[PDB]
Amino acid sequence: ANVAGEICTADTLHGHALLSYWRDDYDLNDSHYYWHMVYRGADFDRHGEVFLYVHSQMVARYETESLCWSLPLVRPWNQYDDFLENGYAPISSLIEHYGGYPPFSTWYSIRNPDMPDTLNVTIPRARLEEWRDNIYA
Amino acid sequence: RVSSDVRGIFALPVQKDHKPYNGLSPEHLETMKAVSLMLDAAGPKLEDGISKAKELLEERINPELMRDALGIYLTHSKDAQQRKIFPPPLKNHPFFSTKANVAGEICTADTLHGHALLSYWRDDYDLNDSHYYWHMVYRGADFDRHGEVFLYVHSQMVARYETESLCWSLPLVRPWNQYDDFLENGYAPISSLIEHYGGYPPFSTWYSIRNPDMPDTLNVTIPRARLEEWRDNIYAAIRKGQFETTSKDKPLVLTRDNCLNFVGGILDAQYPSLNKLLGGCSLDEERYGNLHNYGLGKFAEMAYRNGLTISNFGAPRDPCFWRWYKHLQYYGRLAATRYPQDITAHRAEVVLSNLVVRLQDRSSPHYLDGHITTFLGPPAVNFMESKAKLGHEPYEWNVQVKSCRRSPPSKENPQTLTLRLFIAAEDLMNDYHSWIEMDRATVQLTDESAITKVRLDTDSSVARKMGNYGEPDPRYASAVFRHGWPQNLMLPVGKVEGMPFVAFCIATDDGIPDPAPAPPFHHYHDPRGMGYPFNRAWTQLTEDSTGKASIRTIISNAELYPFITSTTFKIYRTTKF
Amino acid sequence: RVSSDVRGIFALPVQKDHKPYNGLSPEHLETMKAVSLMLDAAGPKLEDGISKAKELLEERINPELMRDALGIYLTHSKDAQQRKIFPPPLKNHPFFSTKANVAGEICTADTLHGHALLSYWRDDYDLNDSHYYWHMVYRGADFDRHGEVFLYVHSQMVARYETESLCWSLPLVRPWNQYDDFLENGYAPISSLIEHYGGYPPFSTWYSIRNPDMPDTLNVTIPRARLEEWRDNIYAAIRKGQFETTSKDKPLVLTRDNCLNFVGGILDAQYPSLNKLLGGCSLDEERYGNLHNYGLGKFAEMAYRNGLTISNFGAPRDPCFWRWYKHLQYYGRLAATRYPQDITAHRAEVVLSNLVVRLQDRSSPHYLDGHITTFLGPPAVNFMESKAKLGHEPYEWNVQVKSCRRSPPSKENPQTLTLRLFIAAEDLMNDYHSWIEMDRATVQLTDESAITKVRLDTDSSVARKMGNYGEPDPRYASAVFRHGWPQNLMLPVGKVEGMPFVAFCIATDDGIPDPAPAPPFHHYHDPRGMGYPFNRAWTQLTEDSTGKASIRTIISNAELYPFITSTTFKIYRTTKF
């Protein structure tokens, strides 16, 4: 019935919260949404090239947008035992359907105990790191 | 069909043929009021007023003018009151509608300066709906104390606003004491409202003489210097202790008892009411003028840009009005220290102890007395709110009362006293005017033994008896107090770590109460003056010769003032997504 | 050995047997002044005063008292002036020494609130040394315009402080207009100074009556209410246009000409000087009191903690005094709008055009007229500075002047006029009192043709003629203007992106100058009143009936006011490590 807006408060305005206008942009989100429908179809040779380029190109824009407000550059998720120190909450209208995570959330080392095996195959952090190490090598 | 006539009228849009209206112009308010009386003059029943209204409307009277007139009319109609027919929710106002997409607020590094963070509090729907009804209540013509109420309500919302400011560690408000001042932050109504009226840029000011681009049909020229003169004269009168009358040597002499009513009354140009006390004499309206309402008019004039109807709408939303409200509060400070009062003069023969402010739910395993909780949830954007919707977990206060009366109270001869509860941010505690009223409650004793009186938040004499967004409360079908303080704003927001406040409770003997004024003025009836005992300076402090005495020492002195008690508590801020 | 006697005296430490002294108490200042006169009474030569001084010192008179007395004495001794013997640099003051390690400032997230960033400006050594000498200059007893100078200097430093505030986007100052106000940020002297005196916590206030823990030997009880009454009476008098005399019906009538001198004079309790103009009558000192100096006394009293000698030291460093200075400025605003002045009344018969503010070095390949530069370098911690040392690249201004006089000027009959230069932050431009004086310069014409007058920054009539830290300037061995405005602070700091300001230049005919007052009062001699033409309201605006007129419109109207011109320029902020 009521339209819930965003909680813009001194408590919620940390990290890259100001960039919310850019990340929540409807047309970015609708574009991204269709992109995956486009991408996930099976002539076209260069899936990997496109994958890397599109993602690198949106990072360059996101980071540049960050600099405009004099905010820090993004810390890449290069170390998989890293913390997400700011935590995240979807805009209030979306909180009904899914949630965020608190400050200093991390990957689960092995698995989420409270997440049923029917949703989620156990892939421990170490297993992903090994793949990463091998692609590096 | 009476109720849908009323909604139909309040929905009427201002069109381009309508004579322009300025709901913040004293001249236009005079006209509006006569039209309101016109409605009253059409007969004893509602359908009479509404017939006159329809008639005037199709004669093309301005609908905004009509909304103000009809609002007052309904509020003070005995027929409407008994038929429980009310002016509509603020939500029905034309400005709460477009002309497809719901525009939210621009929260940006560029727009987050000054007191922008407090937008959640100033845009609060229920504060705004309460304020909106308050003016309908106030603008009706038994009720004696318009000036006292005017000053108290405005001073009390300033104390709360300023305290709310301190919670976020923002600066205190600069009062609009100097009329050549700048508004350095500028203001933009929340995007949904920008359609119907605008704000003003950074470093806007009053116009020295007038807005050149504002038609004379909206706005009588009142130069800044003219307002300053009125101010200077009210200043001078308060210090001298008299307001000059039209007749040379019969000044109205200010007294401890009448100072706030008169100072407040004159600020709001209530010369007809105040004059009825001067035994055939008239207050000099040329000397003291109409400072409050012409003052508001200057902010309207400042904001008017390149006539178009101006609605008295959304004043609490705008930071410039809080600077004016704190200026109003200044007159209260002047009068209050000029006419001190004995803090013992109306003591109840009772000993107070053990004052506590607590959560109602005491189940938490970390629970303590004196640790209570607020939360910031999502604003309701369709109800014109921004940044957050404040609320608090249910609280209660209690206090221990034991009689002290020479004859033991009995079921045959009860002791009746009144408990008055105030809180203050610990830093502001020694300023009388920083004390926030939280409750006023009658206690009746029939024994020698100590009782514990308990009061819920939702029973507070100060509170508006509605849920969020004007949802009704079953328990309070009779006395809704629509123009009271919103329950969700009763507590200052506090700090995440828990902000220290002080609770103060005084027990007074108020004698036998005279009958409360008729609706809708029955909420502001107090033998002691609104905001007692913080509404005048205390003689125990003004006459202190040691220099040691403060509000803090007195309210910590259980020995010498047993009918007063105080206790510290903390308010903790929370976010609920 | 005269010079080393003086340094020896100024170095003398207050010891525990010395009778306590309060350099901010009016009672103690009276004593200090008599002691200063005592020094003067010992003879016509310096060695006379210094002999008396030594004598009094070994009689154990308080050394801080002596420093103030000796300072005034030296400043106004004709012997000392001609012998170029001066009161010592502020750097020699005992507080500029320990009792091993040099303590810097605590710059922390906890300590960076309010206006803490402006510390570089308030702690500036040369501002502080200038202010320190100014009081020695001012406190000497021909010179007529103490009150005018008092108000102007304080209003002019407030305009600069507030403008400096805007450059960092900080709030404007809340004036100390309400005496029951809080100081919500609290203050701590830079760590090197904390040894000799302390600050005060957040939300400190005046004491209502007195500091209980402050001995009566330092501090006469002046309750807050007593100061408010004085304030109220000065307010009332300004509006009424008279100050009451001791004799019932001979009030001193305020005039356009005398208002600031009298308002300023009374604020500073200069009843002996002001009374010499009332033809056998006396101003009512009971009604108007000594508000400025007792006011300063209340901040000293507020800051005094658990007697010990109190030095009048470092007032500009403390944010509470800027709130008092802006309160002083308020009296100036009241008087100024009450007695407007004709902006054409003293026009020079001249046409001004082409006003420019520029760098002196125009070699840069991105160079433009109207783009000038400030820098923030390291503070000199040993000179009690913090956060930065402001400075600016060398600038100049120039303007085009062409005669308009009926007889063409000639070498036989020159036209002499005075050019008056002011700047203002573009946002504050329509406030008279926000205009900052930058220069005043005589021009002599001998032809019909246009000249371009050029003025360097370092020749400014407003500026202190010293390098940083009181280093002398060869070119200005005679007129050092030690108590003038520091050259390094002449420009508001500006913004990195270049902050917009407006330059204003008026040409006046000042007639034939009367002889300038004797040293050390020769810097404040102006036929028009200090800060002209921004020192009173303009009649062109107070009498405007259109509502269109502002300072901005007038100073942009080359047609109607050809003897005024204005131009925009930008100040760019820089850091030099």
Residues in chain B with CB shorter than 8 Å from the CB of C304 are none
Are C202 and B427 an interchain contact pair (Cβ–Cβ within 8 Å)? yes
Q: Are residues B332 and B346 in the same domain?
A: no
> Are the C-beta atoms of residues B64 and B21 closer than 8 Å to each other?
yes
> Are the C-beta atoms of residues C240 and C252 closer than 8 Å to each other?
no
Closest CA to B147 of B268, B14, B306: B268
Rounded to the nearest 5°, which phi and psi values hold at A81? -95, 30
> Are the C-beta atoms of residues C458 and C474 closer than 8 Å to each other?
no
Neighbours of C488 (CB within 10 A): 23
Q: Are residues B132 and B278 in the same domain?
A: yes
CA distance B309 to chain A (A): 29
Are B208 and C547 an interchain contact pair (Cβ–Cβ within 8 Å)? yes
Q: Which domain holds residue C540?
A: 339-577
Q: Are residues B330 and B362 in the same domain?
A: no
- The answer to whether the annotation marks C154 as part of a ligand binding site is yes
The DSSP letter of residue C11 is T
Non-local (6+) Cβ contacts of C437 within 8 A are C156, C420, C421, C422, C462, C531
- Residue B356 pairs in a beta bridge with B398
> Are the C-beta atoms of residues B404 and B349 closer than 8 Å to each other?
yes
Are B205 and C333 an interchain contact pair (Cβ–Cβ within 8 Å)? no
Residues in chain C with CB shorter than 8 Å from the CB of B225 are 337, 542
How far is the C-alpha of A69 from the C-alpha of B111, rounded, in Å? 13
> Are the C-beta atoms of residues B300 and B218 closer than 8 Å to each other?
no
Tokens of C386: 């913090």
Length of chain A as a residue count: 137
In one-letter notation, the amino acid at residue B473 is D
Q: Are residues C363 and C449 in the same domain?
A: yes
Are B182 and C225 an interchain contact pair (Cβ–Cβ within 8 Å)? no
Rounded to the nearest 5°, which phi and psi values hold at C265? -60, -45
Give me the number of domains chain B comprises.
3
Provide the strand spans (E) within C191-257: 242-243, 252-253
Which of A3, A18, A91, A98 to mutate: most B Cβ within 10 Å?
A3
How far is the C-alpha of C373 from the C-alpha of C501, rounded, in Å? 13
From the number of C-beta atoms within 10 Å of its C-beta (0-12, 13-18, 19+), residue A109 rates as: exposed
Tokens of B333: 């400070």
Max CA pair span of chain B = 73
Neighbours of chain A (3+ CB pairs under 8 A): B
Q: Are residues B172 and B23 in the same domain?
A: no
> Are the C-beta atoms of residues B226 and B179 closer than 8 Å to each other?
no
DSSP secondary structure of B53-65: HHHHHHTT--HHH
Are B107 and A10 an interchain contact pair (Cβ–Cβ within 8 Å)? no
| Facing residue for A2 by CB, picked from B109, B380, B387 | B380
In one-letter notation, the amino acid at residue B489 is L
Cα torsion for B405, B408, B411, B415, to the nearest 10°? 0
Closest CA to C529 of C252, C328, C255: C255
Are B182 and C550 an interchain contact pair (Cβ–Cβ within 8 Å)? no
Which single residue is written with the structure tokens 């402010």?
B357
In one-letter notation, the amino acid at residue C260 is L
Q: Are residues C265 and C389 in the same domain?
A: no
Residue C133: its H or E element: helix C125-138
Q: Are residues C233 and C368 in the same domain?
A: no
Which of C200, C229, C239, C432 to mutate: most B Cβ within 10 Å?
C239
Residue C155: its H or E element: helix C146-167
From residue C452, alpha-carbon distances to C350, C455, C560 in Å are: 13, 10, 22
Neighbours of B199 (CB within 10 A): 18
How far is the C-alpha of B458 from the C-alpha of B384, rounded, in Å? 25
Length of chain B as a residue count: 577
Tokens of B75: 């509020």
- The answer to whether the annotation marks A32 as part of a ligand binding site is yes
Non-local (6+) Cβ contacts of B431 within 8 A are B424, B551, C180, C182
Non-local (6+) Cβ contacts of C303 within 8 A are C197, C198, C199, C200, C204
Are A2 and B382 an interchain contact pair (Cβ–Cβ within 8 Å)? yes
Residues in chain A with CB shorter than 8 Å from the CB of B383 are 2
Are A7 and B573 an interchain contact pair (Cβ–Cβ within 8 Å)? no
In one-letter notation, the amino acid at residue C1 is R
> Are the C-beta atoms of residues C300 and C306 closer than 8 Å to each other?
no
3-state secondary structure of C355: strand
> Are the C-beta atoms of residues B165 and B115 closer than 8 Å to each other?
yes
3-state secondary structure of C238: helix
How far is the C-alpha of C490 from the C-alpha of C160, rounded, in Å? 9
| Facing residue for B180 by CB, picked from C205, C210, C333 | C333
Rounded to the nearest 5°, which phi and psi values hold at C160? -65, -45
Residues in chain B with CB shorter than 8 Å from the CB of C544 are 208-209
Minimal-distance CA residue of chain C relative to B551: C208
> Are the C-beta atoms of residues B329 and C220 closer than 8 Å to each other?
no
Are A92 and B577 an interchain contact pair (Cβ–Cβ within 8 Å)? yes
Minimal-distance CA residue of chain B relative to C538: B208
Cis peptide before B379 (omega within 30 of 0): no
CA distance A108 to chain B (A): 24
From the number of C-beta atoms within 10 Å of its C-beta (0-12, 13-18, 19+), residue C496 rates as: exposed
Minimal-distance CA residue of chain A relative to B574: A11
Neighbours of B559 (CB within 10 A): 6
Which single residue is written with the structure tokens 């629970």?
B367
Rounded to the nearest 5°, which phi and psi values hold at C456? -80, 155
Residues in chain A with CB shorter than 8 Å from the CB of B190 are none
Are A4 and B379 an interchain contact pair (Cβ–Cβ within 8 Å)? yes
Q: Are residues B44 and B125 in the same domain?
A: no
Are A5 and B104 an interchain contact pair (Cβ–Cβ within 8 Å)? yes
From the number of C-beta atoms within 10 Å of its C-beta (0-12, 13-18, 19+), residue C574 rates as: middle
Closest CA to B397 of B486, B510, B504: B504
The alpha-helical segments, DSSP class H, found in B224-368 are: 224-240, 259-267, 271-275, 285-288, 291-303, 319-338
Residues in chain B with CB shorter than 8 Å from the CB of A18 are 108-109
From the number of C-beta atoms within 10 Å of its C-beta (0-12, 13-18, 19+), residue B16 rates as: exposed
> Are the C-beta atoms of residues B234 and B327 closer than 8 Å to each other?
no
Non-local (6+) Cβ contacts of B161 within 8 A are B118, B121, B122, B173, B322, B325
Q: What's the CA angle centered on C525, arms C151 and C462, to 5 degrees?
A: 70
| Facing residue for A3 by CB, picked from B102, B117, B577 | B102
Which single residue is written with the structure tokens 């823990």?
C213
Minimal-distance CA residue of chain B relative to A94: B577
Are C177 and B177 an interchain contact pair (Cβ–Cβ within 8 Å)? yes
CA distance A81 to chain B (A): 27
How far is the C-alpha of B317 from the C-alpha of C71, rounded, in Å? 55
How far is the C-alpha of C196 from the C-alpha of C57, rounded, in Å? 21
Looking at C296, C311, C338, the residue that finishes a domain is: C338
Closest CA to C436 of C164, C118, C159: C159
Closest CA to B572 of B501, B520, B487, B479: B501
Determined by which method? X-ray
Are B225 and C545 an interchain contact pair (Cβ–Cβ within 8 Å)? no
Q: Are residues C290 and C373 in the same domain?
A: no
Are B171 and C114 an interchain contact pair (Cβ–Cβ within 8 Å)? yes
Non-local (6+) Cβ contacts of B471 within 8 A are none
Tokens of B455: 């009061």
Minimal-distance CA residue of chain C relative to B323: C174
Are B427 and C182 an interchain contact pair (Cβ–Cβ within 8 Å)? yes
The 3-class secondary structure across B411-461, one letter per residue, is: CCCCEEEEEEEEEEEHHHCCCHHHCEEEEEEEEEECCCCCEEEEEEHHHCC
Non-local (6+) Cβ contacts of C470 within 8 A are C89, C90, C91, C125, C126, C129, C482
- Alpha-carbon radius of gyration of chain A: 18
Residues in chain A with CB shorter than 8 Å from the CB of B109 are 18, 69
Looking at B87, B104, B138, the residue that finishes a domain is: B87
Which of B96, B102, B107 to mutate: most A Cβ within 10 Å?
B107
Non-local (6+) Cβ contacts of B154 within 8 A are B325, B328, B329
3-state secondary structure of B335: helix
Closest CA to B564 of B537, B532, B535: B532
CA distance B184 to chain C (A): 8
Minimal-distance CA residue of chain B relative to A100: B577
Residues in chain B with CB shorter than 8 Å from the CB of A89 are 577
Q: Are residues C343 and C332 in the same domain?
A: no
Closest CA to A16 of A91, A98, A83, A85: A85
How far is the C-alpha of C267 from the C-alpha of C292, rounded, in Å? 5
Q: Are residues B31 and B97 in the same domain?
A: no
* Residues of chain A with a CB closer than 8 angstroms to some CB in chain B: 2-13, 18, 21, 69, 89, 92, 95, 100
Looking at B87, B114, B148, the residue that finishes a domain is: B87
Taking chain A, what is the end-to-end CA distance rounded to the nearest angstrom? 55
Neighbours of A76 (CB within 10 A): 8
CA distance A36 to chain B (A): 27
Residues in chain A with CB shorter than 8 Å from the CB of B102 are 3
Within 13 A of B277's CA, how many CA atoms are on the CB side?
15
The DSSP letter of residue C45 is S
How far is the C-alpha of B180 from the C-alpha of C473, rounded, in Å? 41
Residue C166: its H or E element: helix C146-167
How far is the C-alpha of C573 from the C-alpha of C155, rounded, in Å? 25
> Are the C-beta atoms of residues B114 and B168 closer than 8 Å to each other?
no
Residue B29: its H or E element: helix B26-41
From the number of C-beta atoms within 10 Å of its C-beta (0-12, 13-18, 19+), residue B515 rates as: exposed
Within 13 A of B468's CA, how many CA atoms are on the CB side?
14
In one-letter notation, the amino acid at residue C444 is Q
Helix B259-267 × helix B319-338 angle, to 10°? 150
How far is the C-alpha of C72 from the C-alpha of C355, rounded, in Å? 41
Minimal-distance CA residue of chain B relative to C340: B225
For residue B153, the Cα-to-chain-centroid distance in whole angstroms is 3
Taking chain C, what is the end-to-end CA distance rounded to the nearest angstrom? 41
Question: Under the phi-then-psi rule, with left for phi > 0, alpha for psi from -120 to 50, and beta for the rest, what region is C241?
Answer: left
> After which residues is chain C discontinuous, taking C to N > 2.5 Å?
99, 141, 306
How far is the C-alpha of C479 from the C-alpha of A82, rounded, in Å? 67
The DSSP letter of residue C337 is H
How far is the C-alpha of C570 from the C-alpha of C501, rounded, in Å? 6
| Facing residue for A9 by CB, picked from B102, B376, B381 | B376
> Are the C-beta atoms of residues C459 and C475 closer than 8 Å to each other?
no
- The answer to whether the annotation marks C346 as part of a ligand binding site is no
Q: What's the CA angle centered on B320, arms B162 and C542, to 5 degrees?
A: 135
Interface C:B, ≥3 CB–CB pairs < 8 Å = yes
Residue B37: its H or E element: helix B26-41
The b/e string for C174-190 (b: 16+ C-beta within 10 A; e otherwise) is: bbbbbbbbbbbbbbbbb
How far is the C-alpha of C477 from the C-alpha of A4, rounded, in Å? 72
Q: Are residues C175 and C54 in the same domain?
A: no
DSSP secondary structure of C461-492: TTEE-B-GGG-B-GGGSS---TTSEEGGGSS-
How far is the C-alpha of C537 from the C-alpha of C358, rounded, in Å? 30
